[PDB]
């Protein structure tokens, strides 16, 4: 499945040939990979959960405590607050 972004292997087939020019094939192995289609899936949803997460206040998305998802960190004067 040749493309500029990525060429994936999608078809595998074992083929023999005869001395008279004939061909012997076996059922192929078909493969599929997951697709990316950002226009078809362009789904905006509100996030009311990030209450007051402000680009211009002391806020950041960070992996405190080493979890695989960022929490919301807020840095106050004397305290940090955090929502994991």
């Amino acid at each position: 499945d040749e493309s500029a972004i990525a060429s994936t292997l999608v078809f595998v087939r074992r083929v023999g040939h005869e001395q008279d020019g004939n061909v012997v094939t076996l059922p192929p192995l078909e493969l599929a990979y997951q697709d990316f289609s950002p226009r078809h899936h362009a789904h905006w949803q509100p996030m009311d959960v990030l209450a007051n997460f402000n680009a211009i206040q002391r806020w950041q998305l960070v992996d405190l405590k080493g979890e695989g998802l960022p929490g919301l960190l807020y840095q106050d004067k004397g305290a940090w607050w955090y929502r994991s």
Binding site: A51, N52, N54, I56, Q57, K77
Partner: protein
């Protein structure tokens, strides 16, 4: 608080007792809540 950069809080801080207060120093207004002194500018050496 979850008080954004374009949001205000209306609050008055006051002293409910007898003390050597200056007139107008008995109460302070808090408007943004971030180390908020009720001054447009804070200067500890302005003579006041």
């Amino acid at each position: 608080a979850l008080l954004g950069p374009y949001q205000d809080v209306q609050a008055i801080l006051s002293y409910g007792d007898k003390a050597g207060l200056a007139n107008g120093c008995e109460a302070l207004a808090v408007s943004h809540g971030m180390n908020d002194s009720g001054q447009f500018q804070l200067d500890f050496n302005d003579g006041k």
